[PDB]
Design a binder for these strands. Structure first.
Lengths: 64, 65
RNA sequence: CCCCGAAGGAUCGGGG
RNA sequence: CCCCGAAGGAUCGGGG
């Protein structure tokens, strides 16, 4: 699980790591799947959790 | 053009890839689009969440099985 | 409730 | 600010 705070209007982008083997990934999902939990909301700040095979990159949008 | 659904503290979303979509085809769609996650709005107890993703992926609120 | 941070895979960290 | 919906790909619909 990875945890980041977003406000209204802020996003999160899920590329997939360039290196990892193509087929490799696909099974982990057909089995695993990606999990998006909204672990706690407070005032203006949503606090999200993301759980994803290690071949997916997760970046807050403001990281280019 | 993405998918909108409200969640509360502790509520989730699970992203499946449709069982019929080809293995090799999906990859193409992420390689060129990624999957995006906007928090469109926050109001009180409920978070409003936008998710943009290739028809290859099934977006379901965690409480539908 | 604010504020600030977070290249972080952790249900993140720090301040009023 | 609440309520309740939402198998829905649409920055979702309904009531105070």
């Amino acid at each position: 699980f990875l945890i980041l705070s977003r406000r209204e209007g802020e996003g999160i982008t899920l590329s997939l790591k360039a290196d990892y083997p193509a087929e490799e990934l696909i099974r982990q999902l057909r089995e695993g799947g990606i999990r998006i939990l909204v672990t706690d909301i407070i005032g203006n700040q949503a606090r999200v959790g993301i759980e994803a095979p290690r071949g997916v990159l997760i970046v807050r949008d403001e990281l280019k």
